[PDB]
Amino acid sequence: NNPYLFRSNKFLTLFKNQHGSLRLLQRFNEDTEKLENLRDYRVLEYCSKPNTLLLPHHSDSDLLVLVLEGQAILVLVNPDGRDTYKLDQGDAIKIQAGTPFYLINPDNNQNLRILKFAITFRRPGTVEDFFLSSTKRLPSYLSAFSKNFLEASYDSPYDEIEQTLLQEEQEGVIVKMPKDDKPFNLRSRDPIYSNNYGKLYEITPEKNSQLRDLDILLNCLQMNEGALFVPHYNSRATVILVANEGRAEVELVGLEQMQLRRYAATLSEGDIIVIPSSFPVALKAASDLNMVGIGVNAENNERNFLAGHKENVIRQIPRQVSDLTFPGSGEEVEELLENQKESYFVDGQPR
Amino acid sequence: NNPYLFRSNKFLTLFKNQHGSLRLLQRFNEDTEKLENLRDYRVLEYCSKPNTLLLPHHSDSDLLVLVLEGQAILVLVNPDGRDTYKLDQGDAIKIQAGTPFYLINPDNNQNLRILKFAITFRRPGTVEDFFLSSTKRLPSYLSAFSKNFLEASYDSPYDEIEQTLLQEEQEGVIVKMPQDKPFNLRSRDPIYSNNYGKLYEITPEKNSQLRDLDILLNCLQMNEGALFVPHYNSRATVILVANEGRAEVELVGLEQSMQLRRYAATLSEGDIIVIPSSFPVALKAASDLNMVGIGVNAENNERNFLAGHKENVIRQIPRQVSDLTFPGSGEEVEELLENQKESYFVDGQPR
Amino acid sequence: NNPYLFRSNKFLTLFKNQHGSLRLLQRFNEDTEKLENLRDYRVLEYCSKPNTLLLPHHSDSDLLVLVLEGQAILVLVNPDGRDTYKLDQGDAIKIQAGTPFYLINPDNNQNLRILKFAITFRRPGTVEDFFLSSTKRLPSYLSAFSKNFLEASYDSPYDEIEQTLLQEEQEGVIVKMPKDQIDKPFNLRSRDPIYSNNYGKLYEITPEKNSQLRDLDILLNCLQMNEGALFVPHYNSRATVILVANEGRAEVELVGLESMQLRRYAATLSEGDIIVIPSSFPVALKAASDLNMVGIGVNAENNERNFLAGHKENVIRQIPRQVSDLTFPGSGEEVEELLENQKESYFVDGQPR
Ligand SMILES: [Ca+2]
Ligand SMILES: [Ca+2]
Ligand SMILES: [Ca+2]
């Protein structure tokens, strides 16, 4: 059918109560041999109501954390202290594997939506979270040690340790909270494409130290209803495209082991499509839309356009060769390619 | 029967007409578990008659392109222009994934033979080519986009787009013809040169294009009757491609206490043998011969000789220890090892 | 049941005679899908009696070589000459793939015990040895070439080649020595121990501090504990540690997460026994006797050890009162108090109360 399309319903709920939820996308390679280059990566969605705290835990994986909606306070605990960060909409930050952290939605009215990208290394494709808190879904990891180990460790009788640290709590890992390097914004630089129809912002590993270690680019797409992101392809980056707001009509063109395949889907909020490198892709805004792209294998990526005035590789083929490439003449090919005056994003209204 | 040997007949014909052919070697790991270290690599052979053009296309893979015979004009298309390169025999150049390119045989009389080495990353072991031109085998990938997407993109009626770009013009991708440049395998002094043979070798340490791929390229020329004496590579696995003449290869592997096996084959034009790192190998020229070696995992490769005067590791074992290593005496081992006065290449005539 | 535990009996004997032995641990991923991150690595143990020589051979793999007991002379053969190294107890060195070498136990009285860590690249998970010497288990690899190839190569009649290089002389690849006189090794204990109190010491060499370890992305540590001492619950952020019991008996408790579900892996380790400690998994270790252990940490770059008990480097103590109160069933005050009870750091008295 479409091995590149992941609907909101292909997410497993890890935890949910009335205060928020943690969801985990199935392995990219669960249902297809075609995405073995994504086997090390998992996607998570965290959603929390006003005045909520995700209790402290470390992941066995590196995390890229992105605020899709609202605002957050992120605390990273280290062996000798802690670092406290305010995250606004569009703010991203890397959490190093094995750093205990907790996440607060400090807003009194607006929900918090966070996209988490996991880069796994201990057990490729597997993400584990170690929660200090004992809850219905799992006891504290501390509880797995023997009585003698715990008593000697904390120099305290087991009874005190058990009542003070271990006993299974009444809420889960998201609770209501009293008072009832650095983050970087996806839009911290000038957009790389910008006209009356759309904008794309892009942060690359070349320009960002946190993204450099992961070999990842992040982009942020805004388009007006009826705008069309024209046919183009990425030379190196495979892009995990996340629908944030609005509805996107995607056409993806692939070669499969033999056959030429069209992949066409309308994506609503939460929906994900993978755009493999070299595969031509185009995207029409059915409503005003915001989308986030995560590009893996990002180093030295180059975007090649197949329509419009600027960065159109077809326009760069000389008349002599275009004449032999296409049924038209060099003159007819050149003329047709000049008809589109816009670049990158155009009017997608039919005629 | 020799999992390292790939005869010309283990190539699939991807495309062939009266103007030329493109052939693709089976996956190194198709028929053996012994070459998992080569799973990311594929070999292609392109042959074209005089005054031919391979039509513009991009690959999803990095390409090392090497002219085995003749001359080529190579055009690399970028979003803002194009680079044109003359390739002579022995000239190699890396084509970055997603770079549209076309290949002309400008010669009036001599064929063009090209060796293409594919380094895959999107789908390991799979190489895809995206041809702009519609042909009998497959329509243009542009044709896979919807009518509304194409009309909006090119700001032109579908009729004109279809007649100018999309209709099947050529029957095949080979037709009649009306930053950082190629390097020749012999642009440096050969590393071994005597009356019997020469080896030229370009390493990733000395070539910016090879550095990113961790690959070395070597070029072997021997006179009929010359013998390339037993040696092994510490790190590089060498894909050895017979170009001209007939090569008698002896490869020694430790493959089921382990069973010790000789893999002996005579290689003729197109035939490939893989020489795993650490495996002793020798080659006798049955006729005058030329061969090309592609060495992967090339960084810090060191070639250890088991015979001859220079770079002979056995000669470096002191008498006391060689006396315990070999049935001879230290003196008898030292004396025997001094009998061969030549280095690297010797007279291979039967006693 | 415990997929992280490798008893001395999960080693295959590659070679053994009266002079010593070479043993090879089963693939980390032979019996479990949980150790895919260790697929490229193998562990070997070489043991030799006094006055012994392991005959010249190259490996298809990179080798990290560590003297667990006694002393060695290591000779590396290069195309143009040779390098000779003295290795004492706690000395390690990397041997480059394809470098022929020989190993001597020069001591007259003490055995030589060496831990070999193989980093495979030719055939991931496979380590091969190429011996120049013909023995019962295998003829010389030189013998596998045709007569004509050998005669032309050595410019000698096959009879002299065969008598001088090829004939099976030695019974095995470990032989007695008549006379032992006829970037350099580094010691695990060359720096201050990073943890040291009255109960235990840990020494650690990291890729950040050692060029040989940097190219392999490996850290080595060396653990010494007194009977009754306890290495308190902690975890490694990035390094998966292959823990090798050298002397005495260790009681290990390892806590894993494969809903996913919570698992205790408890084992007592005797000499030779190995346990794998995956990164992020809390671990603790009690010395049943005086104990020495060696850790090989892979994926070592930027590893940080987080302690869950004791005063120093205790991540739990760095959670503010307000949040501790919400994290634990106790109150911020009761949590803070309890975490301050243990006055020691890293290693404590493990005696039951
Ligand atoms: Ca040849
Ligand atoms: Ca002898
Ligand atoms: Ca000794």
UniProtKB/Swiss-Prot annotation, chain C:
One of its GO terms (cellular component) is protein-containing complex. Pfam families: Cupin_1 (PF00190). One of its GO terms (molecular function) is identical protein binding. Keywords: Seed storage protein, Signal, Storage protein. The keyword Signal applies. Homotrimer. Belongs to the 7S seed storage protein family. Seed storage protein. This is Canavalin.
